[PDB]
Amino acid sequence: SLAPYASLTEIEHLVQSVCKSYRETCQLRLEDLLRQRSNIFSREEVTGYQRKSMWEMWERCAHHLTEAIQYVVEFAKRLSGFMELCQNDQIVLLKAGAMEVVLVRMCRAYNADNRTVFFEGKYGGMELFRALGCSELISSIFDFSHSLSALHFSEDEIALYTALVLINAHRPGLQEKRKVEQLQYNLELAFHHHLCKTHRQSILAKLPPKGKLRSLCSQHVERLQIFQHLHPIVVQAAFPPLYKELFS
Amino acid sequence: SLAPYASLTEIEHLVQSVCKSYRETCQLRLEDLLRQRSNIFSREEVTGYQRKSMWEMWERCAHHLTEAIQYVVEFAKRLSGFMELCQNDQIVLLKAGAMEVVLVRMCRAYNADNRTVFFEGKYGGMELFRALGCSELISSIFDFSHSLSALHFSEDEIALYTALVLINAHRPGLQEKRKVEQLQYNLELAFHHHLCKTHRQSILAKLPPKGKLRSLCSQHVERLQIFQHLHPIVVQAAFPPLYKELFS
Amino acid sequence: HKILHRLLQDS
Amino acid sequence: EKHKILHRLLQDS
Ligand SMILES: CS(=O)(=O)c1ccc(CNC(=O)c2cc3c(s2)C2(CCN(Cc4ccccc4Cl)CC2)OCC3)cc1
Ligand SMILES: CS(=O)(=O)c1ccc(CNC(=O)c2cc3c(s2)C2(CCN(Cc4ccccc4Cl)CC2)OCC3)cc1
């Protein structure tokens, strides 16, 4: 909501609204990800992924990331207040934040018991991604999901925290910074109210720093520039156009 | 090869060449596909696929089909004679035949014993594809793979037969039909020579009539037009550009 | 930003 | 309607 001086009733309604927008666009139900924890890639399947060409593995990951971003775009379209921002600001917020929201949501698909992530129907470790040729970035993404796994978020906490990762009034290029600041503040009141009622405000000091998410996004953009030099026709022929627009 | 009056030595060399081009671009190893036959999607996994949105299921299948087409383009680039045809004819042959070659190659991933296909890491029946909204086309594709299954092709037979599905001198729009006729004839000599040496010429009268492959391709183009009317932004945002160019 | 714009106006 | 992508894939080598 963009309402100035939002009352306690409005903040409680905003907590409910944000949680419902997230539930309708969460992509996979948490119970489905948990039910599949015993479905792990066999050693022969891992060898098969590691044998794939770099272009084939980049194309698969770009497709899966694009599908996850499509759900974040729908989350934004349903998020209280987002469609009241100007067209430019909506685009500036999604271009800088859709990838960051996906990286946060991905902690639900990470199993700390065996350090594996749900990918293409089964759970696999970072070794599954070897053919991409960006081991440092993959290892950093697994470490980031591991840091969020340790905070043990509920679905409601993910909904309120991802709304704030997206509604960031400090993004360069915003034209109505003051309007985004009001929406960000109301979402912060909603997140803090939910955390206070459930005795979870102690997680605020444990959230990843202002810089961790930007580093992962900047590394992705850098590795894609290296990939596009080695395979300049694969991107224009097979990658999703939304992916090329956001990261090229 | 486009060489006129190909000798028996040239025909034997062309059999070896076509089999090698196919082996280098077959996408998945036959032994991996066969050894995964007993791994079938559970009833809960099937329900999960059937609960996906139409746009998500179409986008996934367009991606998998595009990856399979990319291997057929590399098969064509390595196929003896293909790169000696004019640029227009190469495009006419791939635009009409890439999808037909993929449909033939997919008989390797089909189990006639339980009517399942290898898809996204496990085997599943036609019910897995229900969210696409084109049950009749999916049933026709499963029937086509079932008709090829009955011939129990070797890998060498698939290589020689798929070369002929692609090098078809009757495709409308060819500008140098005489060169395509010559290349088609040499590939037919190579296919017939291989079949004669292995006592398999009896399969020639059992190959599917050309109209069958034409019908599957035409139905796919029609179902994509129906999909694009219901979801006009999904295609331009997320589908592979090669897919939109070949079928839109 | 042609694609993001179209996704935002799609209903 | 268009063949720009197929053309580029074919001339990649
Ligand atoms: C949202 S959810 O919880 O409902 C859900 C979770 C999982 C899934 C299925 N799994 C996935 O789609 C992925 C798992 C992982 C994915 S996507 C990548 C993303 C980052 N990413 C960039 C990159 C880096 C280097 C090269 C290319 C790319 Cl796109 C790498 C791949 O990180 C490794 C793990 C569906 C839904
Ligand atoms: C070639 S291989 O042997 O190395 C190999 C075998 C299996 C695999 C993994 N499995 C697949 O990629 C697919 C299995 C099936 C596939 S792709 C489709 C293709 C037709 N097709 C169009 C469509 C019809 C209707 C609507 C949209 C589309 Cl794209 C439907 C999907 O037919 C159903 C089965 C990879 C490689």
Side-chain angles (χ1 to χ4, degrees), chain B residues 9-15 17-38:
Chain B
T9 297
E10 290 178 283
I11 289 159
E12 294 181 323
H13 282 324
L14 181 55
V15 171
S17 179
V18 173
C19 290
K20 182 166 171 299
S21 297
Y22 171 76
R23 285 196 311 266
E24 295 172 344
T25 67
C26 65
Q27 186 178 3
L28 292 190
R29 301 191 310 177
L30 183 60
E31 196 61 18
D32 294 341
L33 282 164
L34 298 181
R35 286 177 57 86
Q36 289 193 81
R37 293 276 219 255
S38 293

Side-chain angles (χ1 to χ4, degrees), chain B residues 26-28 33 58 61-62 64-65 99 105-106 108-109 117-119 132 134 137 220 243:
Chain B
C26 65
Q27 186 178 3
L28 292 190
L33 282 164
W58 269 79
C61 294
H64 302 319
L65 181 69
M99 178 57 152
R105 286 175 162 219
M106 293 296 205
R108 300 164 82 234
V117 75
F118 185 71
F119 178 78
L132 292 177
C134 51
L137 169 62
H220 167 233
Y243 177 96

Side-chain angles (χ1 to χ4, degrees), chain A residues 26-28 33 58 61-62 64-65 99 103 105-106 108-109 117-120 129 132 134 137-138 141-142 220 243:
Chain A
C26 64
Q27 185 176 4
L28 291 191
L33 282 161
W58 268 79
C61 293
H64 303 317
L65 180 68
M99 177 66 161
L103 292 174
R105 288 176 160 217
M106 231 59 123
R108 300 165 81 234
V117 73
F118 185 73
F119 179 77
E120 298 197 334
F129 301 94
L132 291 176
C134 50
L137 171 60
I138 297 301
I141 289 167
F142 271 67
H220 171 230
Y243 178 96

Side-chain angles (χ1 to χ4, degrees), chain A residues 27-28 36 39 45 48 51-53 55-56 59-60 63-64 66-67 70-71 120-122 234-243, chain B residues 27-29 32 36 44-45 52-53 55-56 59-60 63-64 66-67 70-71 74 118 120-122 234-243:
Chain A
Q27 185 176 4
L28 291 191
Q36 295 194 80
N39 208 164
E45 284 178 301
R51 193 166 61 228
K52 288 188 179 304
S53 62
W55 68 262
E56 192 194 320
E59 188 176 313
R60 288 186 175 215
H63 174 65
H64 303 317
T66 300
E67 178 184 298
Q70 284 176 84
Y71 283 96
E120 298 197 334
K122 310 197 179 72
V234 178
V235 179
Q236 74 183 268
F239 282 38
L242 181 59
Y243 178 96
Chain B
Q27 186 178 3
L28 292 190
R29 301 191 310 177
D32 294 341
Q36 289 193 81
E44 290 175 329
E45 284 177 302
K52 288 189 179 302
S53 62
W55 68 262
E56 191 194 319
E59 187 176 315
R60 283 167 175 249
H63 174 65
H64 302 319
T66 298
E67 177 186 298
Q70 285 176 85
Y71 282 95
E74 296 310 311
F118 185 71
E120 299 196 336
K122 295 203 186 155
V234 179
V235 179
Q236 74 183 267
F239 282 38
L242 179 61
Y243 177 96

Side-chain angles (χ1 to χ4, degrees), chain A residues 199-205 207-209 211 213-216:
Chain A
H199 197 246
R200 291 272 288 171
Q201 287 191 342
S202 62
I203 75 169
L204 295 174
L207 291 171
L213 274 168
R214 196 202 45 79
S215 174
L216 297 175

Side-chain angles (χ1 to χ4, degrees), chain B residues 17-42 44-86 88-220:
Chain B
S17 179
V18 173
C19 290
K20 182 166 171 299
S21 297
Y22 171 76
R23 285 196 311 266
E24 295 172 344
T25 67
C26 65
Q27 186 178 3
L28 292 190
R29 301 191 310 177
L30 183 60
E31 196 61 18
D32 294 341
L33 282 164
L34 298 181
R35 286 177 57 86
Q36 289 193 81
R37 293 276 219 255
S38 293
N39 296 328
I40 294 161
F41 287 109
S42 64
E44 290 175 329
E45 284 177 302
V46 170
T47 302
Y49 273 105
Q50 300 176 340
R51 286 182 170 150
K52 288 189 179 302
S53 62
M54 177 179 289
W55 68 262
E56 191 194 319
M57 199 53 183
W58 269 79
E59 187 176 315
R60 283 167 175 249
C61 294
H63 174 65
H64 302 319
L65 181 69
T66 298
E67 177 186 298
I69 287 168
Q70 285 176 85
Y71 282 95
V72 169
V73 167
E74 296 310 311
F75 171 64
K77 291 181 71 181
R78 298 183 192 221
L79 183 62
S80 180
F82 185 82
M83 297 303 295
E84 301 165 7
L85 299 176
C86 70
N88 174 83
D89 292 356
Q90 290 178 21
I91 291 166
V92 166
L93 293 179
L94 280 170
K95 206 207 186 138
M99 178 57 152
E100 291 189 1
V101 173
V102 170
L103 294 174
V104 170
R105 286 175 162 219
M106 293 296 205
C107 76
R108 300 164 82 234
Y110 175 83
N111 188 351
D113 294 340
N114 57 12
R115 300 219 69 187
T116 59
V117 75
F118 185 71
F119 178 78
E120 299 196 336
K122 295 203 186 155
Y123 279 80
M126 55 179 203
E127 68 251 37
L128 205 75
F129 303 95
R130 188 173 293 252
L132 292 177
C134 51
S135 306
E136 184 150 24
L137 169 62
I138 296 300
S139 195
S140 293
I141 290 167
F142 270 65
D143 285 359
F144 180 73
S145 294
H146 197 89
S147 74
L148 296 182
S149 185
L151 304 181
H152 45 95
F153 289 137
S154 65
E155 288 291 288
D156 290 336
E157 287 170 338
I158 292 173
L160 297 159
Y161 174 57
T162 62
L164 284 169
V165 167
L166 178 69
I167 311 303
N168 178 345
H170 306 81
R171 301 291 194 198
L174 290 178
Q175 288 171 3
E176 301 181 338
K177 177 181 212 293
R178 73 200 178 272
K179 298 196 191 206
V180 188
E181 280 180 350
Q182 177 71 77
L183 180 58
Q184 180 184 266
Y185 192 67
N186 290 345
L187 293 167
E188 280 174 348
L189 292 179
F191 185 38
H192 300 174
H193 176 72
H194 183 75
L195 294 180
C196 196
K197 297 235 73 176
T198 60
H199 308 269
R200 292 273 290 168
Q201 296 203 323
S202 63
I203 74 169
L204 296 172
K206 293 169 177 179
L207 292 170
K210 294 191 173 186
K212 187 65 66 177
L213 273 168
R214 184 163 87 85
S215 175
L216 297 176
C217 295
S218 299
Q219 282 179 76
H220 167 233

